[PDB]
């Protein structure tokens, strides 16, 4: 139909995050059979192949930002590919990798629909700046490049010349924040970004939280929704095989729930599954739980609802 | 600011509880870096050192109550030190240890603010009497010394001469009770204490529970709040390295949530982290999960909120 029409983009890129090993992100999610587990319900699945990530050998660092140009080239390439698959009328399933790719994943999505919304389900806001981080790791600076209210204040870090900030600060909702460095929360409070952290998640209940999140984004006007989803935003009892595990995340139930509310609007238009890392599970059973979690999250995004999915013929026959 | 201004009081005392080993309570919480993990956000941290616990050699037992005078001397000493750090205008971070210390921890807090409230987050009520317990262990009788409605009925057990009951039965809320011996629940029902056990926690949802808890304590009038927090009140999947583990506790998410609601009133005025015991984890990984849990609980008390914490300067610079 309109929804569950999928363009898969595997993006094995790592150089935004330091723990090398997330480049077996799309490989493990595909060998866990995400394609065929879509194909039971009416999923128009078209794999577009993995993106080539060239290696700039002299990707010389910035002041704090390190590996900048590889990240910027990867996200520009992904912005072109996301714009391609959104001109294909599909829902962009862009899975990596790391949050560095979400720059172009939101950018190329805005190249077709400039008035979308971003549900950034993550343990962290990932809105550090190149100037006021202390890491310089670009797996936590995608959102700072994308907000128009931050323009004139973001440095011209190389690789990011193509970057146009494309989303508004009032057009993004964080859900499941649980570890924020101080620069990101000043940005969070000064821009007036609406957010439901694990405080507000527990306060309203996850259902009233998704109710008010859809009342904030879609309560004004129907518009495309871009669920960009980290897998450390869930609790590390379910996904310990991630890059930055922080205890106290969402239960696996509620992660599936957030995806199902985004489905039952019928307005899912872009999906990111980042920070999957099979190299950091202490046992392969940890990796198995993590990858089965992220697969079933992606299933419940496109309408593998826990209520049921059907084909409209009589089955008493 | 007003909140996140911390006076740390380590209190390595054990003789209220039988399982010796909780006297490495403040040692492990400090070597897990609770001080420095406060110091990112605006935490005025002033360590006041550990309290000396002298050993009464002939601490002769009562009828059922055993090691009474060491508990009473420790809690009187702690009542003086809590009154000292509350005259310092800070929020009393008193971490042990065991719930025997919470006598003086609520008493010295009432010596400055006589009309406070107690959020006793614990698996147990810990309101046995010296007469109608069957243990006689003073890690479960602090609340019976402190309620004015129980006066004329508490024995003059030695060491407890200084004890003035200081809080009202309508001024205390239990959250997360899950194993109560019969004497404590008769006290609980006859005094008309408001409480939200894991029944009522699941009934309202943890957010509506904290909503009605703040509506019960602060809905009448703004007043100081004394979160006295056990670490067995959470589920032993997260803290198995405690003294009395009972299955069915709060999720680690919801424990962090209860602390964050107490923060976002801006009225946190006293904090207890008791029953941490590194000696009872079957693996050191169990101890590691338990201590990281209790540390991040203490962080989310003083406003390491999961939404974010900031310093008010522009970070796009």
């Amino acid at each position: 139909a309109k929804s569950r029409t999928i363009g898969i983009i595997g993006a094995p890129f790592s150089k935004g995050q330091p723990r090398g090993g997330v480049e077996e992100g799309p490989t493990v999610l595909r060998k866990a059979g995400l394609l065929e587990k879509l194909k039971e319900q009416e999923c128009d699945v078209k794999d577009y192949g993995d993106l080539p990530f060239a290696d700039i050998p002299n990707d010389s660092p910035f002041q704090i930002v390190k590996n900048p140009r590889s990240v910027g080239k990867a996200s520009e390439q992904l912005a072109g590919k996301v714009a391609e698959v959104k001109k294909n009328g599909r829902i962009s399933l862009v899975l990596g990798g790391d949050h560095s790719l979400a720059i172009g994943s939101i950018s190329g999505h805005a190249r077709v629909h400039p008035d979308l919304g971003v549900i950034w389900v993550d343990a962290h806001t990932d809105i550090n700046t190149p100037l006021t981080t202390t890491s310089g790791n670009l797996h936590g600076q995608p959102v700072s490049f994308l907000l128009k209210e931050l323009k004139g204040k973001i440095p011209d870090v190389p690789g990011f010349s193509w970057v146009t900030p494309c989303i508004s600060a009032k057009d993004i909702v964080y859900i499941g924040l649980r570890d924020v460095d101080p620069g990101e929360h000043y940005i969070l409070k000064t821009l007036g970004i609406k957010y439901f952290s694990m405080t507000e998640v527990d306060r309203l209940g996850i259902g009233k939280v998704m109710e008010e999140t859809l009342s904030y984004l879609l309560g004004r006007k129907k518009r495309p929704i871009h669920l960009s989803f980290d897998v450390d935003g869930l609790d590390p009892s379910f996904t310990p095989a991630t890059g930055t595990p922080v205890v106290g995340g969402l239960t696996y139930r509620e992660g599936l729930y957030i995806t199902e509310e985004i489905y039952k609007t019928g307005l899912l238009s872009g999906l990111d599954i980042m920070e999957v890392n099979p190299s950091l599970g202490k046992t392969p059973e940890e990796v198995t739980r993590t990858v089965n979690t992220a697969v079933a999250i992606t299933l419940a995004c496109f309408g593998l609802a826990r209520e049921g999915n059907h084909k409209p013929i009589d089955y008493l026959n | 600011a007003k909140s996140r201004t911390i006076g740390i009081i380590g209190a390595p005392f054990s003789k209220g509880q039988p399982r010796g080993g909780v006297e490495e309570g403040p040692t492990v919480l400090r070597k897990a870096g609770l001080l420095e993990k406060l110091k990112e956000q605006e935490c005025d941290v002033k360590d006041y050192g550990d309290l000396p616990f002298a050993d009464i050699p002939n601490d002769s037992p009562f009828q059922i109550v055993k090691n009474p005078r060491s508990v009473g001397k420790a809690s009187e000493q702690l009542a003086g030190k809590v009154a000292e750090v509350k005259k310092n205008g800070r929020i009393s971070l008193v971490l042990g240890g065991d719930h025997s210390l919470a006598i003086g921890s609520i008493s010295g807090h009432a010596r400055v603010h006589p009309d406070l409230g107690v959020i006793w987050v614990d698996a147990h009520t810990d309101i046995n009497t010296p007469l109608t317990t069957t243990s006689g262990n003073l890690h479960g009788q602090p609340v019976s010394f402190l309620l004015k409605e129980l006066k004329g009925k508490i024995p003059d057990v030695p060491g407890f001469s200084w004890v003035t009951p200081c809080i009202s039965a309508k001024d205390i809320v239990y959250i997360g009770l899950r194993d109560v011996d019969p004497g404590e629940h008769y006290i609980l029902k006859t005094l008309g204490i408001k409480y939200f056990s894991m029944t009522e926690v699941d009934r309202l949802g943890i957010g509506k529970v904290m909503e009605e808890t703040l509506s019960y304590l602060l809905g009448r009038k703004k007043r100081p709040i004394h979160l006295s927090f056990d670490v067995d009140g959470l589920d032993p999947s997260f803290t198995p390295a405690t003294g009395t583990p009972v299955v069915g506790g709060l999720t680690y998410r919801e424990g962090l949530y209860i602390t964050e609601e107490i923060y976002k009133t801006g009225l946190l005025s006293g904090l207890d982290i008791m029953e941490v015991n590194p000696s009872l984890g079957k693996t050191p990984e169990e101890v590691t999960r338990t201590v990281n849990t209790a540390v991040a609980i203490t962080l989310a008390c003083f406003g390491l909120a999961r939404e974010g914490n900031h310093k008010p300067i522009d970070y796009l610079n």
Partner: antibody, heavy 125, light 108 residues
């Protein structure tokens, strides 16, 4: 400058372990992360565990899970490594070095730049 | 357990010219490894931090390259204080293996 003063050369039978003191200085601590590596003499080297000093992330290695324990002491910038069920294969020089914390506020680091001086441990009874 | 293989096992070069060394990976470590200076009975100090770029107290002559399977350690201005067992060490895969040994002797 950026160093690691270790302590200290010690032999244990197969029994209790050697909590190796790995004292840091120079660089700001909990902005980075300290790991551990064994080296038997006349052999190669095996990394054996890395903690982030940022927040207690244990992250041990294969064949000792289990056997290793690693904590922080971040009052003083030291970090520690014990062992469990010691064995005469662990007649190794134990080095600690700084992999950088792989958290979120911690700078890009892949490369072990303090190196400590070593710790002569031979597990013989 | 990616095995890191150092192609010069031993080395004996005079005080003088380049002493380019080789370290190979069994996978793509991809510019994520380092170089060390283990003097006998000493601290195996860092030479080269992330396949390049010469960390923080390095003298003048310790360039190197890689990205991403078979890497180089160039000692261009040999400087006979540098006679030590050298180690490459991969990093960004667990568990974090090492090279074999690159005993830089004296050529005489």
């Amino acid at each position: 400058q950026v160093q690691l003063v270790q302590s200290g050369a010690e032999v244990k039978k197969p029994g209790a372990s050697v909590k190796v003191s790995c004292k840091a200085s120079g660089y700001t601590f909990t902005n980075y992360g300290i790991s551990w590596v064994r080296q038997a003499p006349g052999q190669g080297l095996e990394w054996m565990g890395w903690i982030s000093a940022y927040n207690g992330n244990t992250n041990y290695a294969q064949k000792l899970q289990g056997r290793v324990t690693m904590t922080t002491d971040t009052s003083t910038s030291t970090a520690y490594m014990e062992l469990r069920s010691l064995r005469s294969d662990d007649t190794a020089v134990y080095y600690c070095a700084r992999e950088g914390a792989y958290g979120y506020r911690s700078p890009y680091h892949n490369w072990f730049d303090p190196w400590g001086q070593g710790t002569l441990v031979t597990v013989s009874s | 357990e990616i095995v890191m293989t150092q192609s010069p096992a031993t080395l004996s070069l005079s005080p003088g010219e380049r002493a380019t060394l080789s370290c190979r990976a069994s996978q793509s470590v991809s510019s994520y490894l380092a170089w060390y200076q283990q003097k006998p009975g000493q601290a195996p100090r860092l030479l080269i931090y992330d396949a390049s770029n010469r960390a923080t107290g390095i003298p003048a002559r310790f360039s190197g390259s890689g990205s991403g399977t078979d890497f180089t350690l160039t000692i261009s201005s040999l400087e006979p204080e540098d006679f030590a067992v050298y180690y490459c060490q991969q990093h960004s895969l667990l568990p974090r293996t090492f090279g074999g040994g690159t005993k830089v002797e004296i050529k005489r």
